[PDB]
Design a binder for this molecule. Structure first.
Ligand code: HEC
Ligand code: HEC
Ligand code: HEC
Ligand code: HEC
Ligand code: HEC
Ligand code: HEC
Ligand code: HEC
Ligand code: HEC
Ligand code: HEC
Ligand code: HEC
Ligand SMILES: [Ca+2]
Ligand SMILES: [Ca+2]
Ligand SMILES: [Eu+2]
Ligand SMILES: [Eu+2]
Ligand SMILES: [Eu+2]
Ligand SMILES: [Eu+2]
Lengths: 441, 441
């Protein structure tokens, strides 16, 4: 009884439907690797070294997961680099399939397999029990449509159904806006929250089960990859501590033309509606609050770049150590420190809202990353010396995304042409198939 | 015109006099070197490595300066390690001498010279223009009694005489609760604020004038010492941004037994009268707000320790490089990085209020400290390698203050013995002379 076809709800709920549709205006797709080429080096050997953009409107989730280089150019339903779990946070079709096929059945297999199944935009059935008769009557009926997210909330001692209204509001965002990994043979989404949500809890969690996301191809370090941990870091910041929910800033209550209050579904930058967001709680003016936020943004940016630069040198120094014949046992304590430094850095800055949601926590994490990078490069200098190398390791030119991608052995020309071909030809086929099966309108 | 004998004011201003006197209740003198022996290593060759306690009541300023190991046991008025400037932030006799002898005449000579002249407790004339007829009438007539504090406020574009009431409130505290250095042959107190009050502004300021406070005796680094930068960090934090003044929290308006409002002069922990401090602006209860502050205290302490462990290794590694024949030119780039690393650290945590006044800026500075610490230690491992050393440098046992002070070659037993003799012998002579001269009731 999951209804992925969002337009079904438009006549009944035009205020929400129309503002939900309006994230298509948040259309700028900003190239983060271009802005920061050092990312290409840290993520060397991982699909993030190919294509990483800043988040844009919910309306683009499906297009973005289709179009990113990270998903590649699969040639059949069992091909392509990535698994079914990549659709999970993109489309209400995920809730449809989890319902139709069960959770294990949904996760089974490759991302390509879901192409003709997962076609509706991130929407109503992701956050709402749209089956409930109270929903047509205009009550939200908030629900967790994703059982892995429900299990995670229970893991942190906050089961959804026993939570109050205000906790639930943030929990629906917390279905997607979290750090996750792929667990088990089927690569199911799991939130690493069993020992809590602090960078130190997750770090020890991942070490205890010996998990790695990929091996950095320069340093050979078994690495952990952080993703957008908004729920975890918001929980850590002063706003979250005061139960200022994601919704208080992100989905303000606004009035339609006839003066009726509804929830603004145009999920974006809270500053775009300051009067209905921050102004509900703060007497300071818009420019004053923007300036403070911009300053924490810059403070974080400056320290993040320092840590990234240490991390670039460390990877290249570990590369030189390997090139000078370092063995696995020689490298292991170095790679442990790289893994930890980089885990701490990535969780600190993988949420683009960290300077707003929990700037102290972001800054703290970057300091603890820095501590491990120092340990890595110090160990590395001693290892290099034992191989008879006592000079500074030179780094190749990485002044642009293109040079850094080339520096790590990526043929971007081919990766892009194959991708371009996949987008022009396969997508239109997936949409046609979806329509013929009445999955798409 | 300065009246340094505070009790002169007890009849006219009893509510303020009696609460001012009550800082004598705040009497615990907590040994900060015992709590953190790494400080002895960082400060090796400087008096802070001998004796450093946490702040206590204003009532003890004079006592503490007399009794600390840092001022030693001068045998006469031309003796002892420190200058007149050490009196400057302890007593209203400072304001008396500056008026009497001029600011140059006050600064000339040794701390010992001022013993029999600087005898009254930190008090009314330090913050108030008590010579004004308006003062007898109960008006505050706040003033800057310290000309070097007045130049600093003008240097940051905030001349006191033009500042509104509420800016002036924190400026009185900013006569003392700042980072400073000793300038010129006479060792005059100066706030290094010409280029701004940010750690980066001050670092570049001290480098441009080629200033150091001392040479670390292990690494031979020309160091910068930070002191309690409350004014600077308060300005950088969210309260200062909102002109929540030092007074809003530390000197709240309270009622006497007859219901007359007055400024509470018992300057201490704002949480002791939570109902008239935080509760004036916040709805959260005391335990919740104490919990947040304690959490930031812990965050910063955790990171602070990591930085200090890296610095401890850096100084001993530098020691090892020197002992292996490193030249001045070889040491120079490493000492720059230790000097900068340690400056950023010390400025981050030399104010014991940092986790309250500006925890994000504290955490930010510690991360920039760690960036340089990583440079210093990577450099050192390479340089040590050129001397044929490729093993990690072992550190002596510094698990207690006493062990750390032994390791840096302090004869604590003789230092303490000489100091205790001085306290019991010279202080009463000073008091007797002051009384005889009408300076001390
Ligand atoms: C697809 C276009 C839809 C439609 C038809 C609706 N929504 Fe949402 N919604 C979400 C949240 C967090 C709230 C507020 C919850 C609360 O106040 O406790 C709402 C609110 C609603 C309502 C209730 C009426 C109102 O405006 O308050 C209705 C009828 C409604 N919405 C319809 C969360 C989400 C999403 C999270 C990412 C998604 C996507 C949607 N909603 C999508 C839709
Ligand atoms: C809209 C995007 C904003 C912005 C820019 C800010 N807020 Fe809030 N805020 C709220 C509460 C309860 C606090 C704790 C202080 C208190 O007890 O009053 C804050 C704190 C802040 C800060 C300072 C904290 C920091 O991160 O350093 C800043 C810069 C800030 N806020 C900006 C409460 C609310 C709301 C209540 C429902 C809402 C809405 C907002 N804030 C929105 C915003
Ligand atoms: C000349 C080098 C000295 C010496 C020997 C001392 N002072 Fe100060 N002092 C100032 C402030 C604001 C405090 C409280 C805040 C804090 O310590 O973080 C102190 C405290 C002390 C103490 C007690 C604590 C300790 O270190 O054990 C002692 C013994 C002490 N001082 C000695 C302010 C200032 C200044 C304001 C510009 C100046 C100058 C000095 N102090 C100088 C010295
Ligand atoms: C999975 C079904 C999601 C849920 C539930 C929520 N969000 Fe989301 N969000 C998701 C994705 C995959 C993206 C990126 C989309 C793209 O193609 O780039 C986003 C994006 C945002 C943004 C950025 C918007 C922009 O930059 O223009 C914001 C501020 C945001 N999301 C907030 C947000 C809130 C508050 C949520 C709970 C009401 C929420 N999201 C839920 C995936 C999912
Ligand atoms: C939730 C549990 C997710 C899983 C599993 C995956 N993604 Fe996602 N994605 C999620 C959110 C909340 C956001 C927006 C916030 C942000 O910081 O990015 C995104 C965004 C994307 C994007 C657009 C931004 C970009 O990186 O270019 C893409 C292309 C993307 N996601 C792809 C993608 C892939 C390939 C996944 C499987 C590894 C995947 N996502 C999983 C939430 C979640
Ligand atoms: C105000 C108290 C907020 C709360 C609570 C939440 N968010 Fe937020 N977020 C807020 C602002 C003002 C900004 C913009 C920062 C800026 O420099 O303008 C953001 C940013 C995000 C982002 C990054 C989006 C992007 O860069 O594309 C995301 C994904 C986001 N916010 C999501 C989010 C979630 C899921 C929240 C609850 C866990 C949440 N925010 C709370 C303001 C506030
Ligand atoms: C700085 C550490 C101070 C010292 C030492 C003393 N006073 Fe004070 N006083 C100070 C401030 C910052 C204020 C508040 C000014 C404002 O704008 O509100 C005051 C206030 C007074 C007043 C005014 C009446 C009142 O608000 O209580 C008086 C008469 C006064 N103070 C007297 C006084 C006496 C007698 C002192 C020594 C025993 C003394 N003050 C010390 C700052 C400081
Ligand atoms: C020099 C004349 C000062 C002025 C003016 C102010 N403060 Fe101060 N303070 C000063 C010293 C030398 C000390 C340490 C005293 C000691 O012997 O340890 C302090 C201490 C404080 C404290 C700590 C109190 C305690 O720990 O019990 C606080 C909270 C404090 N000072 C705050 C403060 C405020 C708000 C001021 C302006 C009203 C102020 N101080 C002025 C030196 C001087
Ligand atoms: C509340 C918004 C404050 C303002 C503004 C200022 N101070 Fe403060 N300070 C505050 C608290 C609650 C505390 C104690 C923190 C804790 O862990 O309980 C402090 C601490 C200090 C200290 C350290 C005192 C000590 O450890 O002995 C000092 C010296 C101090 N505060 C001084 C000070 C100055 C000079 C300020 C204006 C520049 C200032 N504070 C503002 C609360 C608040
Ligand atoms: C007004 C004269 C205040 C007094 C007294 C105290 N606080 Fe405050 N606080 C005030 C403002 C205007 C703000 C900015 C947020 C806002 O409401 O606009 C704050 C902020 C805080 C915070 C959050 C920021 C942070 O430091 O992480 C905390 C934790 C806080 N305040 C605590 C606190 C305590 C413990 C106080 C007494 C010692 C206190 N505040 C006094 C205004 C004022
Ligand atoms: Ca992850
Ligand atoms: Ca100094
Ligand atoms: Eu965006
Ligand atoms: Eu104290
Ligand atoms: Eu408030
Ligand atoms: Eu804050």
């Amino acid at each position: 009884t999951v209804e992925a076809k969002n337009e079904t709800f438009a006549p009944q709920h035009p205020d929400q439907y129309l503002s939900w549709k309006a994230t298509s205006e948040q259309s700028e797709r900003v190239d983060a690797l271009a802005e920061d080429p050092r990312l290409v080096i840290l993520w060397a050997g991982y699909p993030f070294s190919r294509d990483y953009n800043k988040p844009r409107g919910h309306a683009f989730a499906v297009t973005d997961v289709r179009e990113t280089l990270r998903t590649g150019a699969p040639k059949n339903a069992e091909d392509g680099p990535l698994p079914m779990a990549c659709w999970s946070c993109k489309s209400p079709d995920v809730a449809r399939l989890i319902q139709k096929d069960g959770e294990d059945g949904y996760f089974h297999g490759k991302w390509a397999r879901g192409g003709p199944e997962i076609v509706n935009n991130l929407g109503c059935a992701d956050c709402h029990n749209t089956a409930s008769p109270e929903f047509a009557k205009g009550k939200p009926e908030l629900t967790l449509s994703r059982p892995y997210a429900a299990r995670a909330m229970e893991a942190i001692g906050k089961p959804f159904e026993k939570a109050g209204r205000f906790d639930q509001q943030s929990m629906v965002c917390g279905q997607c806006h979290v750090e996750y990994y792929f667990d088990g043979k089927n690569k199911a989404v799991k939130f690493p929250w069993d020992d809590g949500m602090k960078v130190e809890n997750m770090e020890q969690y991942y070490d205890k089960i010996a998990f790695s996301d990929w091996t950095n191809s320069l340093s050979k370090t078994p690495m952990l990859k952080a993703q957008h941990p908004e729920y975890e870091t918001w929980t850590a910041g002063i706003h979250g501590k005061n139960n200022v929910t994601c919704i208080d800033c992100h989905m303000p209550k606004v009035q339609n033309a006839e003066g009726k209050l509804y929830t603004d579904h145009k999920i974006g930058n809270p500053f775009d509606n300051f009067a209905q967001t921050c102004a509900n709680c703060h007497t300071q003016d818009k420019a004053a609050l923007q300036k403070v936020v911009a300053e924490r943004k810059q403070s974080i940016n400056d320290l993040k770049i320092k840590v990234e630069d240490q991390l670039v040198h460390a990877h290249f120094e570990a590369k030189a150590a390997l090139d000078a014949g370092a063995t696995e046992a020689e490298m292991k304590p170095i790679q442990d420190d790289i893994r930890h430094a980089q885990w701490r850095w990535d969780l600190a800055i993988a949420s683009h809202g960290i300077h707003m949601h929990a700037p102290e926590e972001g800054l703290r994490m970057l300091g603890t990353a820095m501590d491990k990078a120092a340990d890595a490069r110090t160990k590395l200098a001693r290892l290099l010396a034992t191989k008879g190398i006592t000079h500074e390791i030179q780094i190749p030119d990485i002044s642009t995304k293109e040079k850094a991608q080339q520096a790590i052995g990526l043929n971007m020309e081919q990766i892009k042409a194959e991708k371009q071909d996949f987008i022009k030809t396969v997508i239109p086929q997936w949409e046609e198939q979806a329509r013929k099966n009445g999955l798409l309108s």
